Amino acid sequence: DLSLEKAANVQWDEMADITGSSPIIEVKQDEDGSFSI
Amino acid sequence: RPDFCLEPPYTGPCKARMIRYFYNAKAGLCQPFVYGGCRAKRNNFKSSEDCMRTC
Amino acid sequence: LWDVPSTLSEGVYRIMQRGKTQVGVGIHMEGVFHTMWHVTRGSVICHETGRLEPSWADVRNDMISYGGGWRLGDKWDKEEDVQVLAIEPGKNPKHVQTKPGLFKTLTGEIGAVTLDFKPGTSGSPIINKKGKVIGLYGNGVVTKSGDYVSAITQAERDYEVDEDIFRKKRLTIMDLHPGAGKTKRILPSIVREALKRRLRTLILAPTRVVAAEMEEALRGLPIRYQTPAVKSEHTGREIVDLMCHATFTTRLLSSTRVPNYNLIVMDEAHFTDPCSVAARGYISTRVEMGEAAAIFMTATPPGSIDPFPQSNSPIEDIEREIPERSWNTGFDWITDYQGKTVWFVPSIKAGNDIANCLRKSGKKVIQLSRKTFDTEYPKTKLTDWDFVVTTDISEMGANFRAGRVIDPRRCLKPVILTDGPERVILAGPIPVTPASAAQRRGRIGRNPAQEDDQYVFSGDPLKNDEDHAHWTEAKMLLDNIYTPEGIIPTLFGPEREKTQAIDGEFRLRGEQRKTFVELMRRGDLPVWLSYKVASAGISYKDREWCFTGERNNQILEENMEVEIWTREGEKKKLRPKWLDARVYADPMALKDFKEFASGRK
Known part of the structure; x- marks a missing residue:
C-alpha cells in the first residue's frame, strides 16, 4: 500500500550546478534489468 | 547456517529505498538495511522472522 | 498491458510507504504515471481519493507504467547536456546538470550520469535541453574506482494479424x-x-x-x-x-x-x-x-483436455477437500486466507448456503448467477469484497482481481429424459469438464505482480457432457433459423456429434415459431419447455398447460405442493404438462415461473 506526494513540475534550471564526470564504462545488463561489468 | 548469511548487507546498484533484513554475523542477528531494488543477495529478507529462521 | 479495468495532475511525485518514508519517485505525464520496475513491482498506488493500477511494463529495462502506455520517447542525442531532477527523501528537489558518460551495453549503447543520490531517488526524472524527460535516474552500476554511475532509462513508443x-x-x-x-x-x-x-x-x-x-x-x-x-x-x-x-x-x-x-x-x-x-x-x-x-x-478450443494449462503468472495447484455445505469447523484455511477468493459452486442453492456461512464470519460475499451476473458483477469491481460465490457463468470472460480460486469441480447438468414422458431434469452435482475446470482455474494466474495465486480444488474432471440438454436445445433454435439460400444450418462441427438429432426436425411453421421466440423472450422459459409448448399449438397467453399435468409433475417449494391463483381468481396446483426442472431449481426461477403460470406475465 503506497501513497503519492507532490514534489515538482518538470522544468530545466538556468540556475543549476554543473557536476559529474563522463566516463565510458562497458557494462552489460541481465534479464531482470540489472547492470554489472 | 548457510554460507550466504556470512555476507554483510548488500544495497544494490539501484536507488530505491526498501527496508529489508540482513544477518550481521559479527552482531549475530538480522538488522534492517536499505535495499536499492536490484540484484539482491541472499542475505536479504522481507521480514525478520524469515531471517532468524533462515539464519 | 496487464489485466484490469477501473486525481490525475502532472508533476513528479514521491512514492511513499507508511511502514511514512520515500521509497521512489515517479512522473505523472499526461494521464499516465512512470516509474522503474524495481521501485513498485506492480503494486497499486492510492492518493487524492483515487487509485492507480499498472498498465504496461518492460521488466527487461526496469520500467513500469500506471494508467496507460509510455509515450515519453524523447531520447538523448548523445551530446546534449542533461539535468537530473532528484527528489531525495525528506529534501526539497534539486536540479543537477551534467554531460553524460556512456554505459556501452554491447547489445546497444546509451548514456549514463555519474551522480550519487540517496536511497529513495529511483525514478527521479532526467530532463533535457528542451524541457522534456529523456530518462529516469536510479538503475546503474558501481565503478571499478568505487564510484556510482546510473544509466538513463526511457522507452521507445502492437499486434499484426495474418x-x-x-x-x-x-x-x-x-x-x-x-x-x-x-x-x-x-x-x-x-x-x-x-x-x-x-x-x-x-x-x-x-x-x-x-x-x-x-x-x-x-x-x-x-x-x-x-x-x-x-x-x-x-x-x-x-x-x-x-x-x-x-x-x-x-x-x-x-x-x-x-x-x-x-x-x-x-x-x-x-x-x-x-x-x-x-x-x-x-x-x-x-x-x-x-x-x-x-x-x-x-482459451479452451475443441479438443482441450488439460485442466492445468500454462499461465502467464505462477499458479499453485493445491488439492484438498472443500466443503459442499455450511460448515462449523475444520476448514480454517478458507477464512484465514487474507486475499480475495472466487469460489465456484454447482448451484444457486449451494451458493446461497456457502455464502451465508461465509457472511457469518464477517466476510463480504458477492454472489453471481446466470441471470444476476450483469447486475452484480460490476459490484465486485466498484466495491471491496472477500469472496465471490459463483456458478459456471463466471467461466465466460469475467475478470477478477483475486489471488485464490476454490473449485470443487462440480456442476448441475440439464438432461432431457426419454423414459416415456419427455422431461428435463438437473442431474448432479457431477464432475465438470476439463475445459470447465481450466476456465475456472483461469480466473487467476494473470496478475504478473502476484506469484502466490492458488487454485484449491477437489476431484477429477469428466468428459461426459453428451447427454447435455443444451445441444438438443441449440438444434431446436437452429432449425428455426431460415436461410435465404435454403441451406442446412447445422451445429458447429466439433459439437455436432453431441446430439443424434436429424437436422431440421424442430422447424416450426410461422405462428408457432413466433410464440416459441416469445415464450423464450417474454416468458423467460427454457428452450426445451418453450419448444414443447409452442409446437403444441398453444398461444403465449394461454397458461392452462401449467396446471393440466400428471400428478408426478407437481412442483414443490420448500416441501410444499405449490398452489397458485390464476389471473381469473381460480386457485390451482402448479402441475405443468411438461416438466423442466430449471423453472423450479432456485427461488428466483420458481418466482418467475409462478408469475408466468398466473398469467401476470
Whole structure:
C-alpha cells in the first residue's frame, strides 16, 4: 500500500550546478534489468 | 547456517529505498538495511522472522 | 498491458510507504504515471481519493507504467547536456546538470550520469535541453574506482494479424489465454484492419459486461452496440456491430434484415449456452457457404483436455477437500486466507448456503448467477469484497482481481429424459469438464505482480457432457433459423456429434415459431419447455398447460405442493404438462415461473 506526494513540475534550471564526470564504462545488463561489468 | 548469511548487507546498484533484513554475523542477528531494488543477495529478507529462521 | 479495468495532475511525485518514508519517485505525464520496475513491482498506488493500477511494463529495462502506455520517447542525442531532477527523501528537489558518460551495453549503447543520490531517488526524472524527460535516474552500476554511475532509462513508443484469417470460407480458432492481450490488443487490431478491408464486421460477446469491456478497448473506432430490443439496425455508414451471443441468435430467430456479415468474431466461443451453440452453428454455415470469415476466440478450443494449462503468472495447484455445505469447523484455511477468493459452486442453492456461512464470519460475499451476473458483477469491481460465490457463468470472460480460486469441480447438468414422458431434469452435482475446470482455474494466474495465486480444488474432471440438454436445445433454435439460400444450418462441427438429432426436425411453421421466440423472450422459459409448448399449438397467453399435468409433475417449494391463483381468481396446483426442472431449481426461477403460470406475465 503506497501513497503519492507532490514534489515538482518538470522544468530545466538556468540556475543549476554543473557536476559529474563522463566516463565510458562497458557494462552489460541481465534479464531482470540489472547492470554489472 | 548457510554460507550466504556470512555476507554483510548488500544495497544494490539501484536507488530505491526498501527496508529489508540482513544477518550481521559479527552482531549475530538480522538488522534492517536499505535495499536499492536490484540484484539482491541472499542475505536479504522481507521480514525478520524469515531471517532468524533462515539464519 | 496487464489485466484490469477501473486525481490525475502532472508533476513528479514521491512514492511513499507508511511502514511514512520515500521509497521512489515517479512522473505523472499526461494521464499516465512512470516509474522503474524495481521501485513498485506492480503494486497499486492510492492518493487524492483515487487509485492507480499498472498498465504496461518492460521488466527487461526496469520500467513500469500506471494508467496507460509510455509515450515519453524523447531520447538523448548523445551530446546534449542533461539535468537530473532528484527528489531525495525528506529534501526539497534539486536540479543537477551534467554531460553524460556512456554505459556501452554491447547489445546497444546509451548514456549514463555519474551522480550519487540517496536511497529513495529511483525514478527521479532526467530532463533535457528542451524541457522534456529523456530518462529516469536510479538503475546503474558501481565503478571499478568505487564510484556510482546510473544509466538513463526511457522507452521507445502492437499486434499484426495474418491476412489468411480474413479469407472467406476460412474459420480460425484463436487459442488466446489471459495475458495475450486479447481484448486490449488483438481484437482492436483485428477490427482496425478489417475496417481497412471495408468488411462488414460483427463481434459477439458472452455477456453485457464483456461487451462493455470491448467498448472500452475499441474506443475511437466506429462500434455500435446492438440491444436485443431491436430486431435489426442498418446504417449506410461504415460501422462495426457489437452484441451478445444471445442477441445474435434472437435477431436470427425473429428478424429478416440480418446483415451479410463477412467477418464474424466470437469471444469466449466455448460458451455452451444454447444461444451460443446455435450462433456457432449459423456462423459455421455462413463460412462454409463462402459468405464470411469467422474467428472463434477461447482459451479452451475443441479438443482441450488439460485442466492445468500454462499461465502467464505462477499458479499453485493445491488439492484438498472443500466443503459442499455450511460448515462449523475444520476448514480454517478458507477464512484465514487474507486475499480475495472466487469460489465456484454447482448451484444457486449451494451458493446461497456457502455464502451465508461465509457472511457469518464477517466476510463480504458477492454472489453471481446466470441471470444476476450483469447486475452484480460490476459490484465486485466498484466495491471491496472477500469472496465471490459463483456458478459456471463466471467461466465466460469475467475478470477478477483475486489471488485464490476454490473449485470443487462440480456442476448441475440439464438432461432431457426419454423414459416415456419427455422431461428435463438437473442431474448432479457431477464432475465438470476439463475445459470447465481450466476456465475456472483461469480466473487467476494473470496478475504478473502476484506469484502466490492458488487454485484449491477437489476431484477429477469428466468428459461426459453428451447427454447435455443444451445441444438438443441449440438444434431446436437452429432449425428455426431460415436461410435465404435454403441451406442446412447445422451445429458447429466439433459439437455436432453431441446430439443424434436429424437436422431440421424442430422447424416450426410461422405462428408457432413466433410464440416459441416469445415464450423464450417474454416468458423467460427454457428452450426445451418453450419448444414443447409452442409446437403444441398453444398461444403465449394461454397458461392452462401449467396446471393440466400428471400428478408426478407437481412442483414443490420448500416441501410444499405449490398452489397458485390464476389471473381469473381460480386457485390451482402448479402441475405443468411438461416438466423442466430449471423453472423450479432456485427461488428466483420458481418466482418467475409462478408469475408466468398466473398469467401476470
